[PDB]
């Protein structure tokens, strides 16, 4: 996946879209606006490098690069921002609905071929490389050109041309009084038609709920941290890329702005002699270390040379049984090693053979790791990983090697001496009962970082000028109420068995 993502929102502006069947139900136009705003927010948080556009068709006024009638391009393909979100929200309310009607109009003839043509023109106007070209059609009508067949053929031809070009189109059908029949006219326009999505739809599209589900997490495309070299011998060599399947999430770095005008300010640093008052360079400086009364002076190049043992890469040392790899011997997050094949040919077969043989023998490959030049070597273990996929053939664990850092002697610390005190069988049984009561299934993505979520919510409130920032419920709390209600009298019995009455913990 190389390039950017392009999304164009097509919101129909017919009379039927501006009417609500039942009370306490937002009109389809407002629902589309909210969905667009949610998508904009999700794109801003996850990846702001993508391009989003908003185009309205069926309006009285027209604004297009070709001067097509009855089409308005509210926002051209550009990176999302708070200004576009506010502009969309301006039409959110009923007063916003009136403003949209006054400044845009509604209830005019339109051609699907025309909107597809303007969308294609917008796509062709992007100078950046687009990995995905997508269009979303928000419309509750299923038979727009029911009074004319030539327009239907023109729309079919335009949709076919867009499909051939590589444009991927979706129809976000909304609620209709009578019902939505995709099989009537839109079946031949959607890029992919599902067999299930054939019956008449009397409710909202399921995609709308997914779109409205805001996601707050940065999405990073696949990228190799380093294309290192694995050397089984001074002559045998292969190339392997290193990836970080797990990486700590940090909030975006702050930026300095000028209070008076709120503009970026450049930060610079300089070094000069207090006597000569002239600029100095790193090559005109020495590093000093004072131990007691003695002073030791070394050049910067010498200090860099201090931590130089071997060239960057991985050097094989041997194979060790997996039983000898302690679970508690953890120092840094593990990495993933996968064959590259873009540098040396024939490495993939060797990697596969090594993986299968290590899995059969249950042996991890011990190696010396030097991620970069002038970096002290470390001892790492590569444990083979078996490609694991859950139901419906979705991968959950890729095949390769898991690189785990083995702590050195210095990294280990000695604990204070303690006297063992065995627990009686009754107390162990009570604890077993408590644990069984508090049983729960764990998954890798069952918790959210409260700090990052709160920061994102605060930034959203600041940018959109919202009244207050919606408090983010944190799942990291132990919800003591439910645990107490579930345990019952087990805690009291355990305290009586273990804790003496005159303890007061």
């Amino acid at each position: 996946y190389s390039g950017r993502d392009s999304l164009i929102f097509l919101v129909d502006a017919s009379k039927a879209m501006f009417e609500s069947q039942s009370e306490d139900e937002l009109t389809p136009f407002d629902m589309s606006i909210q969905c667009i705003q949610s998508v904009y927010i999700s794109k801003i948080i996850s990846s702001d490098r993508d391009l989003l556009a908003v185009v309205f068709y069926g309006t009285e006024k027209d604004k297009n690069s070709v001067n097509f009638k009855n089409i308005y391009v509210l926002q051209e393909l550009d990176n999302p921002g708070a200004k576009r979100i506010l502009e969309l929200d301006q039409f959110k309310g009923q007063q916003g609905q009136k403003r949209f009607q006054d400044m845009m109009g509604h209830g005019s003839d339109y051609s699907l071929s025309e909107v597809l043509w303007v969308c294609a023109n917008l796509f062709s106007d992007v100078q950046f490389k687009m990995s995905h070209k997508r269009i979303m059609l928000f419309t509750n009508e299923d038979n727009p050109h029911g009074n004319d067949s030539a327009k239907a053929s023109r729309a079919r031809t335009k949709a076919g041309d867009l499909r051939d070009t590589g444009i991927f189109l979706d129809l976000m059908h909304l609620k209709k009084p009578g019902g939505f029949d995709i099989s009537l006219f839109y079946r031949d326009i959607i890029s992919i038609a599902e067999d299930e999505d054939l019956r008449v739809h009397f409710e909202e599209s399921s995609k709308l709920e997914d779109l409205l589900r805001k996601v707050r997490a940065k999405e990073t495309r696949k990228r190799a941290l380093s294309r290192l070299k694995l050397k089984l011998n001074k002559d045998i060599v292969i190339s392997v890329g290193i990836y970080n399947l797990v990486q700590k999430a940090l909030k975006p770095p702050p930026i300095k702005l000028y209070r008076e005008t709120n503009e970026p300010v450049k930060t610079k640093t300089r070094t000069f002699n207090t006597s000569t008052g002239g600029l100095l360079l790193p090559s005109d400086t020495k590093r000093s270390q004072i131990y007691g009364s003695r002073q030791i002076i070394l050049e910067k190049e010498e200090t860099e040379e201090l931590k130089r043992f071997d060239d960057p890469g991985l050097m094989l040392m041997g194979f060790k049984p997996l039983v000898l790899l302690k679970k508690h011997h953890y120092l840094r997050p593990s990495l993933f090693v996968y064959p590259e094949e873009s540098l040396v040919i024939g490495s993939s077969t060797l990697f596969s053979a090594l993986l299968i043989k290590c899995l059969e023998k249950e042996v991890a490959a011990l190696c010396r790791y030097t991620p970069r030049r002038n970096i002290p070597p470390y001892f790492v273990a590569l444990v083979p990983q078996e490609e694991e996929l859950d139901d419906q053939k979705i991968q959950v664990t890729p095949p390769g090697f898991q690189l785990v850092f083995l702590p050195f002697a210095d990294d280990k610390r000695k604990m204070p001496f303690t006297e063992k005190i065995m627990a009686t069988p009754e107390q162990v049984g009570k604890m077993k009962a408590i644990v069984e009561k508090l049983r729960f299934t764990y998954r890798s993505d069952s918790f959210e970082n409260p700090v990052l979520q709160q920061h994102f919510r605060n930034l959203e409130a600041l940018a959109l000028d919202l009244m207050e920032p919606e408090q983010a419920v944190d799942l990291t709390l132990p919800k003591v109420e439910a645990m107490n209600k579930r345990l019952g009298s087990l805690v009291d019995e355990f305290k009586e068995l273990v804790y003496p009455p005159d303890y007061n913990p």
Partner: protein, 94 residues
């Protein structure tokens, strides 16, 4: 589409004239009734010629796009023939 049948047909016209191929290509795409008068067509052609003299292809492209989007397949074919300066109506200039 550059690899689509229409693109190859337009490009591979055996350098059955190009006007007929363009008309066939534009028939399913163009409208049924244009809205350009003779004066507007002449003005657009004059603008195209002047821009070509001035070496400005952006205006030429804009004018061609306007002509394409505001005319019918028959009008497109006749405009192409006029631009090429080859009509062959069956009656001589005399």
């Amino acid at each position: 589409p550059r690899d689509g049948k229409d693109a190859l047909k337009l490009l591979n016209y055996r350098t059955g004239d190009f006007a007929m191929i363009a008309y066939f290509v534009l028939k399913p795409r163009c409208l049924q009734k244009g809205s350009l008068t003779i004066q507007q067509v002449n003005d657009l052609l004059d603008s195209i010629a002047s821009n070509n003299s001035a070496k400005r292809k952006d205006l030429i492209k804009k004018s061609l796009l306007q002509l394409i989007t505001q005319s019918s397949a028959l009008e497109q074919k006749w405009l192409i023939r006029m631009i090429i300066k080859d009509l062959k109506l069956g009656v001589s200039q005399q």
